[PDB]
Write a protein that binds this ligand. Structure first.
Ligand SMILES: CC(C)(C)c1ccc(N(C(=O)c2c[nH]cn2)[C@@H](C(=O)NC2CCCCC2)c2cccnc2)cc1
Ligand SMILES: CC(C)(C)c1ccc(N(C(=O)c2c[nH]cn2)[C@@H](C(=O)NC2CCCCC2)c2cccnc2)cc1
Lengths: 298, 298
């Protein structure tokens, strides 16, 4: 009765366009009279190892970028580069543009992803920005340009644009000003995701979700200090817990009457003695892709 | 790299309206000039045990149904009942109506759910029609009228409307002609979901997904007959396997070169010897909410 929920994708579906440059097609985002898309759309098949993007873009004209919004083709009247994004000024302003904002998210935070291919939305799902700045997405060839987003009231907050797959099958991209999450670059190199860790804030939020949904078997009578917990957390590749996290879990702690450091003693016991065949909220592992905000929303 | 993916919900978001009758509010679906919604919206707070819906509806007029499409209120110009649904003819035809169809799904099949409250879409997620004709959804108070759907090309296939929660926390509803899935009724009674079972077709599809995504540890050298497998399946509360299922898994069998009855010997070994700490496609349990169609789509 508790699961990954994506935001309704209608407001973003209206802004999804196709952007073709030579032999390469990928998705872009059309807000007002601008189309944002990954700049590597101008990289050539021969030049994937060491492209110089300033160089490749001086050589382009407006007419080298085909932009198709569904049936209707848009005419480009200008172009520029912002970090790893390209900005294409088009003639028409998108009539379906929503109230929107560009935000840079932090590790642990979650968002919905609209997976698109050739400008055509195909799927929506929820995921989290990992601590190693990758995302565990479901992106196939030509998903580049797909965006990730959160919706509050009527206001879309774009936080991610997809650029590339890394060798482990996870994914890298940028915010909507083109700055990458993590130390990744939009070329073919030998770059790997660094070692990942488990998002302690999110596990604790989930245990509080489980308690609120009536499952309570993992609770215990013990307490722990923050330092005592962080020694167990380091052994099990979990992010250290901070006072800031303890503060964030306040409202959840009040609702259930279970002190945060009590919940931490509970989690520490789970990490040391396994789950021995039981299930939490339907899971047999410790979920770390729900935030404190996500749990309250559900 | 493989997960629950919902269809993009934009085409259904445009048809979500609010329907108020007295003290009760719930969601409805506005296609053309008709609004479909659960008939129990006319049930009164006093009459939940034994309402007579023919009786309660003769007593209503068009002006007892408030219909709000976002800001604008719609005027109702007629009303009738189709099984467990109410049909409200309104003055305006919905301009955002998509190409659409009403279909009745079968157990094991999956669909996307747009969770709505007070006409306002709030979330989208994927689920499956269980063999006991319930759905394991995430519906809170006033989600009634939320619909479930599949999209092919530009054509929305509405298959479920939500009506009620059953005592175990699972959910019952109807197709879009108002006929319930299962033997449930839209009153407060002592009705329970019957015992559920595991969707064997879907587990086998998932194992084929796992193989296609490079995970292969559970394969073995043995084969099984269909009858030999169904004796293990009965012991573990799994649906029997039929020739029709074997036929459905054909394309998946060809793509991976693993014969269906080979995959069944594999699954039988998983059921008898556990997973002993390993993971399939990121899971430590046997997923049964992906169809053969879902696996190919991803
Ligand atoms: C030029 C540059 C920056 C190296 C690049 C090249 C190819 C793509 N990939 C496009 O599919 C694609 C490219 N252009 C249109 N589509 C895919 C991709 O990342 N393969 C990686 C494997 C080789 C090493 C670098 C990239 C992809 C697959 C699945 C999900 N997401 C993306 C992305 C970036
Ligand atoms: C009149 C009738 C048919 C018995 C009924 C009554 C209440 C509702 N429930 C509305 O929330 C609701 C009702 N009208 C507007 N909202 C909820 C519901 O099922 N409680 C059940 C518990 C008591 C026994 C029967 C119903 C609900 C909760 C969470 C997710 N889904 C629905 C549904 C149907």
């Amino acid at each position: 009765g508790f699961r990954k929920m994506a935001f309704p994708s209608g407001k973003v579906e209206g802004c999804m366009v196709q952007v073709t440059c030579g032999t390469t097609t990928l998705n872009g985002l059309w807000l007002d009279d601008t189309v944002y898309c990954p700049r590597h759309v101008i990289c050539t098949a021969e030049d994937m190892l060491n492209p110089n993007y300033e160089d490749l873009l001086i050589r382009k004209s407006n007419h080298s970028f085909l932009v198709q919004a569904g049936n209707v083709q848009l005419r480009v009247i200008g172009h520029s580069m912002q970090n790893c994004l390209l900005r294409l000024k088009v003639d028409t302003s998108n009539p379906k543009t929503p109230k929107y904002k560009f935000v840079r998210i932090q590790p642990g935070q979650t968002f919905s992803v609209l997976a698109c291919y050739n400008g055509s939305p195909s799927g929506v799902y929820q995921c989290a920005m990992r601590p190693n700045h990758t995302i565990k997405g479901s992106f196939l060839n030509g998903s580049c340009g797909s965006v990730g987003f959160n919706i509050d009231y009527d206001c879309v907050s774009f936080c991610y644009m997809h650029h590339m797959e890394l060798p482990t099958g996870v994914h890298a991209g940028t915010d909507l000003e083109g700055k990458f999450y993590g130390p990744f670059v939009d070329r073919q190199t030998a770059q790997a995701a660094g070692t990942d860790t488990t998002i302690t804030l999110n596990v604790l939020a989930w245990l509080y979700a489980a308690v609120i949904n009536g499952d309570r078997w993992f609770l215990n009578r013990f307490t722990t200090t923050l330092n005592d917990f962080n020694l167990v957390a380091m052994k099990y590749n979990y992010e250290p817990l901070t006072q800031d996290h303890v503060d964030i879990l306040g409202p959840l702690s009040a609702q259930t009457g279970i002190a945060v450091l009590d919940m931490c003693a509970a989690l520490k016991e789970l990490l040391q003695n396994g789950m021995n065949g039981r299930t939490i909220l339907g899971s047999t592992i410790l979920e770390d892709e729900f935030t404190p905000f996500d749990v309250v929303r559900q």
